[PDB]
Coordinates of N, CA and C in Angstrom, one line a residue:
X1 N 29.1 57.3 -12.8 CA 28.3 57.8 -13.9 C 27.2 56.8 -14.2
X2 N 27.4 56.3 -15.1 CA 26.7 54.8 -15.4 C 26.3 53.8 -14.1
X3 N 27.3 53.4 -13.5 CA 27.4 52.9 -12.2 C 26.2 53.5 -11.2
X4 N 26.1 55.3 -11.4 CA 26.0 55.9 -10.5 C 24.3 55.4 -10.2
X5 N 23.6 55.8 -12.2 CA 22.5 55.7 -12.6 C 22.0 54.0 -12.5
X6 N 22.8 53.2 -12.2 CA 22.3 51.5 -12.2 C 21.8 51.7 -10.2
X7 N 22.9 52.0 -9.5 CA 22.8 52.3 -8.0 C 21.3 53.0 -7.7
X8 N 21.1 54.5 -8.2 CA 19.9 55.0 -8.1 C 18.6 54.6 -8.5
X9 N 18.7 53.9 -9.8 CA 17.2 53.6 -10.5 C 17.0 51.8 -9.9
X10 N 18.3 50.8 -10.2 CA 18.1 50.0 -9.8 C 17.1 48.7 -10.4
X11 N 16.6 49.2 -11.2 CA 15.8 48.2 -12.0 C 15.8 48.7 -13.7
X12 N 16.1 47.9 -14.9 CA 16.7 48.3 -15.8 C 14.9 47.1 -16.2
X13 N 14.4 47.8 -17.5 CA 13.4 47.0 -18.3 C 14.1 46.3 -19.7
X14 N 14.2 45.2 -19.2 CA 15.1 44.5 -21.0 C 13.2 44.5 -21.8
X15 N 13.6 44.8 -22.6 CA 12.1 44.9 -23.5 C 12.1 43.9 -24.6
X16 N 11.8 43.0 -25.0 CA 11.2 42.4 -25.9 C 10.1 42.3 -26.2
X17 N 9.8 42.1 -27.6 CA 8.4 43.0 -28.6 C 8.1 42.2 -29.7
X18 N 7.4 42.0 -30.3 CA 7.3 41.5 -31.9 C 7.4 42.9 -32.6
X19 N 7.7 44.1 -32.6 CA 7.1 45.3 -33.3 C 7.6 46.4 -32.7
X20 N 8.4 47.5 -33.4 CA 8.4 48.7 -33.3 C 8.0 49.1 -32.7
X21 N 6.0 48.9 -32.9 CA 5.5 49.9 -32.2 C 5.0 49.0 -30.8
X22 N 4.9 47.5 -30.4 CA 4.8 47.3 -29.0 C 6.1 47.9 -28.3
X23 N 7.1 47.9 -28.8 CA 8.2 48.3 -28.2 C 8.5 49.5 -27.6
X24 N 8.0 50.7 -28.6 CA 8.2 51.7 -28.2 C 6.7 52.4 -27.1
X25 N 5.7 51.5 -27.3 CA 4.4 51.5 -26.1 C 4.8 51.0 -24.7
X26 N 6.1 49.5 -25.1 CA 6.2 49.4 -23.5 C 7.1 50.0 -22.6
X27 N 7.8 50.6 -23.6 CA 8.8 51.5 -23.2 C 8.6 52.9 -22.6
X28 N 7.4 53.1 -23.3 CA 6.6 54.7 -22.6 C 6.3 53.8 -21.5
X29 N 5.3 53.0 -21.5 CA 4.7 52.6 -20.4 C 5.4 52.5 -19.2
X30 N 6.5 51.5 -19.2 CA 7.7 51.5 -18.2 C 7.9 52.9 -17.7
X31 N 8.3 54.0 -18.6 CA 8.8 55.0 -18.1 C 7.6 55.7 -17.3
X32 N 6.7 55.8 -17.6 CA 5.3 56.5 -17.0 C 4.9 55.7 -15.6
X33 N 5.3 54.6 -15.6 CA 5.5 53.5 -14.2 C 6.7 53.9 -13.7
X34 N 7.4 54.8 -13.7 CA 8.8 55.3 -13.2 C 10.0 54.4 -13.0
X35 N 10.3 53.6 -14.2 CA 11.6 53.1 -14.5 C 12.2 53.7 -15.9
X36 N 13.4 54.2 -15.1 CA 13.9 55.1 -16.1 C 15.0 54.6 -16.9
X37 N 15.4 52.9 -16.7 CA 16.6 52.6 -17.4 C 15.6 51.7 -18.0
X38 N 15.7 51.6 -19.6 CA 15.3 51.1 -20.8 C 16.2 50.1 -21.1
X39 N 16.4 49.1 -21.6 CA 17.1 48.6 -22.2 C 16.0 47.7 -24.1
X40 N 16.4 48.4 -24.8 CA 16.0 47.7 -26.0 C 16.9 46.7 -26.5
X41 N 15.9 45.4 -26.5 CA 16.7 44.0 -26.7 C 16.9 44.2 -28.2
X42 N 18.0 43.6 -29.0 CA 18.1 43.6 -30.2 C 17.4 42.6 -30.9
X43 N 16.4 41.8 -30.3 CA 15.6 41.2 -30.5 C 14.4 41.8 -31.0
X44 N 14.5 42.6 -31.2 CA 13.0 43.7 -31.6 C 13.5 44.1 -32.7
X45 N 12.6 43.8 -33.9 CA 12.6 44.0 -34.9 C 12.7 45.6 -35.0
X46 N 14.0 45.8 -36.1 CA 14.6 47.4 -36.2 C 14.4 47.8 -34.6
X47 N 15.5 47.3 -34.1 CA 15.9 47.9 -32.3 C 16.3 49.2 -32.4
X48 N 17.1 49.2 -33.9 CA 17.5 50.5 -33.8 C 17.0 51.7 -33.6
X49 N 15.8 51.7 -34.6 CA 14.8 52.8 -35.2 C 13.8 52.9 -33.7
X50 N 13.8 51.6 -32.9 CA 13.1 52.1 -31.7 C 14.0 52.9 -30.5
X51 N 15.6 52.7 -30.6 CA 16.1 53.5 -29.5 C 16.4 55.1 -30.1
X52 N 16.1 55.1 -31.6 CA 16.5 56.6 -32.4 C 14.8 56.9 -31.4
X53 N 13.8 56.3 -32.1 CA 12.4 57.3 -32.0 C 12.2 57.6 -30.4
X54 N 12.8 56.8 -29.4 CA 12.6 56.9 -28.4 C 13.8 58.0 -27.4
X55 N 14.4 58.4 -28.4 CA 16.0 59.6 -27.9 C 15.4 60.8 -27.3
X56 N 13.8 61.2 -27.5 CA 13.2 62.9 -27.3 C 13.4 62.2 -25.4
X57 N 13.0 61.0 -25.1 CA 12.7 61.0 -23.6 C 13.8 60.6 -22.7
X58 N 14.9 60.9 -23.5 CA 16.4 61.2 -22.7 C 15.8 62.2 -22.5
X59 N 15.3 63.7 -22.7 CA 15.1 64.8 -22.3 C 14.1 64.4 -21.1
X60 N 13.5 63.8 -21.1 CA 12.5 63.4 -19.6 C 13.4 62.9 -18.3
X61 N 14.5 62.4 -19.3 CA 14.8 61.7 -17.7 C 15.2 60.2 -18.0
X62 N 14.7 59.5 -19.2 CA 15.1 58.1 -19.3 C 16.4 58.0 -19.7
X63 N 17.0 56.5 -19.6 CA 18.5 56.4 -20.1 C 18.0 55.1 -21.0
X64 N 18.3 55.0 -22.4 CA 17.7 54.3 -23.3 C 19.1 53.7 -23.8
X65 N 18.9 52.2 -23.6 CA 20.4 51.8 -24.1 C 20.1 50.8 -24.9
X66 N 20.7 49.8 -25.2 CA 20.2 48.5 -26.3 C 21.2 46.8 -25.5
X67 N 20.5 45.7 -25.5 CA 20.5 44.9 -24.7 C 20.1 43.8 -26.3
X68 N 21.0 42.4 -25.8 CA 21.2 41.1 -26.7 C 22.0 41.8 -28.1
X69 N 23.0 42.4 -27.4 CA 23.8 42.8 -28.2 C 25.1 41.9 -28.6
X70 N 25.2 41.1 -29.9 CA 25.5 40.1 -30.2 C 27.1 40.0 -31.3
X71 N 27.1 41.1 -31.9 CA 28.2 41.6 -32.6 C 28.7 43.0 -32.6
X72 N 29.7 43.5 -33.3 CA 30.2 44.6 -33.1 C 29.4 45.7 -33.9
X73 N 28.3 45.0 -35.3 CA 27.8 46.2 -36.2 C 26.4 45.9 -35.1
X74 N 26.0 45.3 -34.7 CA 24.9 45.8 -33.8 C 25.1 46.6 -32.9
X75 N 26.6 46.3 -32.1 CA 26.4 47.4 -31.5 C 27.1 49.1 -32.0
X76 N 27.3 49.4 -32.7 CA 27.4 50.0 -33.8 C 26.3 50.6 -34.3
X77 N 25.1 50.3 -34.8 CA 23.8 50.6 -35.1 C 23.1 51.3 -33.9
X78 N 23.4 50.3 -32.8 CA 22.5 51.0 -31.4 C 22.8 51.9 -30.9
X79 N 24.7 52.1 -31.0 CA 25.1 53.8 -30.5 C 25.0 54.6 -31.1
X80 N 25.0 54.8 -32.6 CA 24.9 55.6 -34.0 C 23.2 55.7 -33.6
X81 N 22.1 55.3 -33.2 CA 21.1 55.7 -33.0 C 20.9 56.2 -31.5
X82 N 22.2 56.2 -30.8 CA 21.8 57.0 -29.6 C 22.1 56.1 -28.3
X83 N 21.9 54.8 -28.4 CA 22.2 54.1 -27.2 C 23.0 54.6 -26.6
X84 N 22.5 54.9 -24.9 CA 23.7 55.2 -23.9 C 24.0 53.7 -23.1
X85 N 23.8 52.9 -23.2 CA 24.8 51.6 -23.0 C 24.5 50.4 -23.0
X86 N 25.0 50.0 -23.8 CA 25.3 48.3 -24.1 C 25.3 47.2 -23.3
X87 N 24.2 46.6 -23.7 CA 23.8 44.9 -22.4 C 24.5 43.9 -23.1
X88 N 25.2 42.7 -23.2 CA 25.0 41.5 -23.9 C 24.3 40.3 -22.9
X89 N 23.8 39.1 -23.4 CA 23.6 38.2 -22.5 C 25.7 37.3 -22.2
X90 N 26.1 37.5 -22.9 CA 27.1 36.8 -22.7 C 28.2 37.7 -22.7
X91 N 29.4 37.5 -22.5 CA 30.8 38.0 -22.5 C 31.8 38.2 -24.0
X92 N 31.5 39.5 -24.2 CA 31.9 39.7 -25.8 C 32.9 40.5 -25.9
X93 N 34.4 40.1 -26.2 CA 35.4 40.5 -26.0 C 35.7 41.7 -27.5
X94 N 35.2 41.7 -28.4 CA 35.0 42.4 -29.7 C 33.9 43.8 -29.4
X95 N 33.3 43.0 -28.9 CA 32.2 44.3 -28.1 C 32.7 45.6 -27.1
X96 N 33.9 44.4 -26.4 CA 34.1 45.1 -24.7 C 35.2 46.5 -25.4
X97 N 36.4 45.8 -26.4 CA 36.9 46.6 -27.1 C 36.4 48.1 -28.1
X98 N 35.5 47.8 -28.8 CA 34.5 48.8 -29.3 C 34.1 49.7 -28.6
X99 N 33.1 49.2 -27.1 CA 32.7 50.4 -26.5 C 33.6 51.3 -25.9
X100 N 34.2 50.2 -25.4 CA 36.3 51.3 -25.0 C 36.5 52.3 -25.3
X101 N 36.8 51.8 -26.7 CA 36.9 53.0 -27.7 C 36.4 54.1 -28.2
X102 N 34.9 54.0 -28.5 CA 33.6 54.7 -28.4 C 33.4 55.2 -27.1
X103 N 33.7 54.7 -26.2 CA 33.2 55.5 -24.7 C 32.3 55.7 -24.4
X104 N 31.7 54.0 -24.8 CA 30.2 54.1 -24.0 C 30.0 52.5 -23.0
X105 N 29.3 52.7 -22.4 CA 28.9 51.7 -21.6 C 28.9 50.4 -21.4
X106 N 29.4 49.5 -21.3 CA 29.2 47.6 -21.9 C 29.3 46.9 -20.4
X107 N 27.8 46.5 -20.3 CA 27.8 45.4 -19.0 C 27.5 44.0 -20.2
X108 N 28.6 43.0 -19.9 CA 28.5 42.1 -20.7 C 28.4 41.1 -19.4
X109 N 26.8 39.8 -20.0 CA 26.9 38.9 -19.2 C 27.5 37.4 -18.9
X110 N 27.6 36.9 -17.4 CA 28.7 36.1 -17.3 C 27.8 35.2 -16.5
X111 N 28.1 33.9 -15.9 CA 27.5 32.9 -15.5 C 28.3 32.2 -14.8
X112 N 29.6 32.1 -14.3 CA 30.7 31.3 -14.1 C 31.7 32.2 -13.3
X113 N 32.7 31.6 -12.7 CA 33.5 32.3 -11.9 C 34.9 32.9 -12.6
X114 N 35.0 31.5 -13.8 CA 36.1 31.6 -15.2 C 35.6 33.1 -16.1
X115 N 34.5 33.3 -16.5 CA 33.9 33.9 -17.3 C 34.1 35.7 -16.8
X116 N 33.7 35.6 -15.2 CA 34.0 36.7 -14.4 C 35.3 37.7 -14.3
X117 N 36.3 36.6 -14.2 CA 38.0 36.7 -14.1 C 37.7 37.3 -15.6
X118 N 37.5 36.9 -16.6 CA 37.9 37.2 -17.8 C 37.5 39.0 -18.0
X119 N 36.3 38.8 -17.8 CA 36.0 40.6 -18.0 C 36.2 41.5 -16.7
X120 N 36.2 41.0 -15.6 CA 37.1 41.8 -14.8 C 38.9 42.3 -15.6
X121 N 39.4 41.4 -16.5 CA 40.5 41.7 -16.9 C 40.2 42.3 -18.0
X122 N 39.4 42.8 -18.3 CA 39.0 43.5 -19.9 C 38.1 44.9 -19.4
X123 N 38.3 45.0 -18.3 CA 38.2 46.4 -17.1 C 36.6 46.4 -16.5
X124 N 36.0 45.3 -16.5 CA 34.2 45.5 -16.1 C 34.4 45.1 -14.9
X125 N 33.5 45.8 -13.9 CA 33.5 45.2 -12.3 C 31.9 45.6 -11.8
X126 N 31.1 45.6 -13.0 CA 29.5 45.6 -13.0 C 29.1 44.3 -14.5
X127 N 28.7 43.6 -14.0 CA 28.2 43.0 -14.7 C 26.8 41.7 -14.9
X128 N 26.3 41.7 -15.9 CA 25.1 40.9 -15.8 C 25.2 39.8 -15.4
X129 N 24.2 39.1 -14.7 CA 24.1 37.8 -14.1 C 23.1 37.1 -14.7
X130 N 23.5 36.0 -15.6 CA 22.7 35.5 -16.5 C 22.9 34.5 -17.2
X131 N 21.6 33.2 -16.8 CA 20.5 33.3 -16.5 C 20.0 32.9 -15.0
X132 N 19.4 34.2 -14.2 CA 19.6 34.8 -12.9 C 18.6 33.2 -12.1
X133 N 17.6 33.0 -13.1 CA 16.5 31.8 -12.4 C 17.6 30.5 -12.5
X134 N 18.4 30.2 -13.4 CA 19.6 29.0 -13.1 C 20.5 29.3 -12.0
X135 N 21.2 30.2 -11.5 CA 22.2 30.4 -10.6 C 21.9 30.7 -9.5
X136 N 20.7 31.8 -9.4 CA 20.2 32.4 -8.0 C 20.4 33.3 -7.4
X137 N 20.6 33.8 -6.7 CA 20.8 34.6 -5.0 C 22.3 34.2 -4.9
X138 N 22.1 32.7 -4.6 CA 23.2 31.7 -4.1 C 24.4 31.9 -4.7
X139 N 24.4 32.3 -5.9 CA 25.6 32.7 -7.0 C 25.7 34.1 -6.5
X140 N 25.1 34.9 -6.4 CA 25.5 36.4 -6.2 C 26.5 36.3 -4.9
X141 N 25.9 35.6 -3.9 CA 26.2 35.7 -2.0 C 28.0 34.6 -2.7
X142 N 27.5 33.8 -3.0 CA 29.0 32.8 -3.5 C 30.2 33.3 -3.8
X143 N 29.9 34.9 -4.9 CA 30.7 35.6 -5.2 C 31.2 36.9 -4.5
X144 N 30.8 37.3 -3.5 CA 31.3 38.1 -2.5 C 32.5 38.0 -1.7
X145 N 32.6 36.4 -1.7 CA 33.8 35.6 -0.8 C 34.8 36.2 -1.3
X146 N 35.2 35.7 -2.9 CA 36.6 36.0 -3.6 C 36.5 37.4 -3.8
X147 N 35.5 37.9 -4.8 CA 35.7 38.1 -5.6 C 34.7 40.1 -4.7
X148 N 35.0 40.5 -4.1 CA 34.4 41.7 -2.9 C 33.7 42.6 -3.8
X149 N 34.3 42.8 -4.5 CA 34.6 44.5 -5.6 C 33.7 44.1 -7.0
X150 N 33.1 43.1 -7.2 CA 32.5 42.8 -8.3 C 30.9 43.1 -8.4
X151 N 30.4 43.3 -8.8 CA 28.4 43.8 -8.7 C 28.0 43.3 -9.6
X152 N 26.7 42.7 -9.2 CA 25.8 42.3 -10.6 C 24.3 42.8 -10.7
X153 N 24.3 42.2 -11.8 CA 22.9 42.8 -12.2 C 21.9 41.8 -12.6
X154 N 21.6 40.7 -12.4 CA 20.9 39.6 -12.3 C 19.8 40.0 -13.5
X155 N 20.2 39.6 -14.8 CA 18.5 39.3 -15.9 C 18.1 37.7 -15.9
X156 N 16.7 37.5 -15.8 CA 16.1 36.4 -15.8 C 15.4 35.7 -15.0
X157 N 14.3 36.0 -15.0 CA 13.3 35.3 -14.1 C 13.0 36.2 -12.8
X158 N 14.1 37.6 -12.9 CA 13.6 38.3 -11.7 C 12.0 38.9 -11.7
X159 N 11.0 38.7 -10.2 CA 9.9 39.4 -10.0 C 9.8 39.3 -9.0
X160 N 8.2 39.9 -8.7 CA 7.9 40.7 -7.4 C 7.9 39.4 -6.3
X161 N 7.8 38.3 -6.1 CA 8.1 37.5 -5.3 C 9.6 37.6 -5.0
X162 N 10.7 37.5 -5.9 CA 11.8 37.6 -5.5 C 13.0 38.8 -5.9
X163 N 12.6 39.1 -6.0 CA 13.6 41.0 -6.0 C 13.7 41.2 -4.7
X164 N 12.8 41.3 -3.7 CA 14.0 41.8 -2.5 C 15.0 40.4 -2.0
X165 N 14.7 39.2 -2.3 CA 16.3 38.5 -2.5 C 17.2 38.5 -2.5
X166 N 16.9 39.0 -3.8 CA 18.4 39.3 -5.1 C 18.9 40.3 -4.1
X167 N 18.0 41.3 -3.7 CA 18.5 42.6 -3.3 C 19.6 42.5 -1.6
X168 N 18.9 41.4 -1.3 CA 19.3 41.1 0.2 C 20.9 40.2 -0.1
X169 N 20.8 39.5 -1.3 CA 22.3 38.3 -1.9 C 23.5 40.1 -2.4
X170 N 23.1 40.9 -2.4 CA 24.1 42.0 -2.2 C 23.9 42.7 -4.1
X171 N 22.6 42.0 -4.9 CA 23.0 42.6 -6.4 C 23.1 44.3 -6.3
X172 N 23.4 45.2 -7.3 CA 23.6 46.4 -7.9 C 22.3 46.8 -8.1
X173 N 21.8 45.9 -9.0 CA 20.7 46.5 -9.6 C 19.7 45.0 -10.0
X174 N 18.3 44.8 -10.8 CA 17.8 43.9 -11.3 C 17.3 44.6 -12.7
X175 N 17.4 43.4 -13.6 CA 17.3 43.5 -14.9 C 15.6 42.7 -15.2
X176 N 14.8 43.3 -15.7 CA 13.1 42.8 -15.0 C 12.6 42.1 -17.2
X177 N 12.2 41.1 -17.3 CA 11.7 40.9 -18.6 C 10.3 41.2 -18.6
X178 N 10.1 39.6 -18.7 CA 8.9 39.1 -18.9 C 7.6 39.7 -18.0
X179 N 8.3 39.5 -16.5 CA 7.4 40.2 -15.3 C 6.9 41.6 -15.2
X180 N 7.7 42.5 -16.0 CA 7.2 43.8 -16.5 C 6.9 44.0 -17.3
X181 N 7.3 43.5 -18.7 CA 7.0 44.1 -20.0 C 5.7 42.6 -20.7
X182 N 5.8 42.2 -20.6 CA 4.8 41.5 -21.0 C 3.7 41.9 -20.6
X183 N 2.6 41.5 -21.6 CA 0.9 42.3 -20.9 C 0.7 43.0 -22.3
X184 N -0.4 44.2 -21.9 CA -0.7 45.3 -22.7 C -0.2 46.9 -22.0
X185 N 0.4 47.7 -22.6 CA 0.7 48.8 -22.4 C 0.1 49.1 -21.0
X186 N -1.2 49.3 -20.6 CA -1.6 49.3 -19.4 C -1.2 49.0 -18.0
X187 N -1.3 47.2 -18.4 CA -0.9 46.1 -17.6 C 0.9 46.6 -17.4
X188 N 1.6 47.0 -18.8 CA 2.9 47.0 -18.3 C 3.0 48.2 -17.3
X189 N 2.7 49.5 -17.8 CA 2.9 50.4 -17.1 C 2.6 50.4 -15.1
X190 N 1.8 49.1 -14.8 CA 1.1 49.1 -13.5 C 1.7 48.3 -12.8
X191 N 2.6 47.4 -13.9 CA 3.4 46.2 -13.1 C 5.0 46.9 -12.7
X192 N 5.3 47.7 -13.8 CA 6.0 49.0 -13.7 C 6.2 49.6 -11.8
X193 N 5.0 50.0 -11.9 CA 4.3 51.4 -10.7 C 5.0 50.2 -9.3
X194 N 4.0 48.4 -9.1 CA 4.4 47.7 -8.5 C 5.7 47.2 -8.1
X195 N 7.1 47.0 -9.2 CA 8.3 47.0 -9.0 C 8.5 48.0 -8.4
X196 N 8.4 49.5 -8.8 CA 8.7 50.3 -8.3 C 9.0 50.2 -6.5
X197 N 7.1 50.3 -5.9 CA 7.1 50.2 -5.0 C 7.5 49.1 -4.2
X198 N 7.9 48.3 -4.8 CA 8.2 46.4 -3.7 C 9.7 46.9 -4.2
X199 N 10.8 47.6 -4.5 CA 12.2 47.4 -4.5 C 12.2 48.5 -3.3
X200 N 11.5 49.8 -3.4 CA 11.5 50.9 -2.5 C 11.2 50.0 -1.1
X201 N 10.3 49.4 -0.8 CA 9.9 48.4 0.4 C 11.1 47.4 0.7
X202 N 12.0 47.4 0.0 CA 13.0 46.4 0.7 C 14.2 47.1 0.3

């Protein structure tokens, strides 16, 4: 399901904004550049109100979920407004519990081989890779040895120089910041269209 949609689309937009409304601009934009997995960072002022106003383009096709999710009433807020699934940068055992429960989505991120073991035992075997520009490729290819059955999703520092990398070190998917969403609505949407085409090229 979830899994299925990270496999297919393959590039997820973490969005950070000063504003509502750059957020919900880069978010069209992204999607009109044809990346359909959203992630709204809880970093964006009222994250919430931007993944409610943004719920009509689940009907288009987008999967809008909420990302720097840091306690249990945030994430709480982001599902109650619709989030289909929950990013953290770190490993949140209060979190991992909640979504369980709720039955929604939680890729929590990990950095370490100790950190890995842990939420593999708290049932995750997709998880974020983070911070992807400190560890590398070399971390992804490292963890194939032990650990076969585990997938990641690399946020930080990925772009169009190094995405087919990541892609070739065996990741799931790439999690895109700065290199996409930064700019103006325009500029995002184009840089968008470009990931597109350089992940389809490799």
């Amino acid at each position: 399901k979830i899994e299925e949609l990270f496999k297919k689309h393959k590039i997820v937009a973490v969005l950070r904004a000063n504003s509502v409304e750059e957020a919900k601009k880069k978010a069209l934009a992204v999607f009109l550049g044809g990346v359909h997995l959203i992630e709204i960072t809880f970093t964006v002022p009222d994250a919430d109100t931007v993944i409610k106003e943004l719920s009509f383009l689940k009907e288009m096709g987008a999967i809008i979920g909420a990302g720097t999710v840091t306690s249990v009433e945030q994430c709480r807020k982001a599902v109650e407004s619709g989030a289909e699934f929950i990013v953290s940068p770190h490993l949140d055992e209060e979190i991992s519990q909640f979504c369980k429960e709720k039955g929604v989505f939680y890729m929590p991120g990990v950095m370490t081989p100790t950190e890995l073991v842990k939420a593999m035992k708290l049932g995750h075997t997709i998880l974020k890779l983070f911070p992807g520009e400190v560890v590398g490729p070399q971390f992804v290819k490292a963890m194939k040895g032990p650990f076969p059955n585990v997938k990641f999703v690399p946020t930080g520092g990925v772009n169009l120089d190094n995405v087919c990398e990541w892609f070739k070190a065996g990741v799931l998917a790439v999690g895109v910041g700065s290199a996409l969403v930064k700019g103006t609505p325009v500029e995002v949407a184009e840089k968008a269209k470009a990931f597109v085409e350089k992940i389809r090229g490799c």
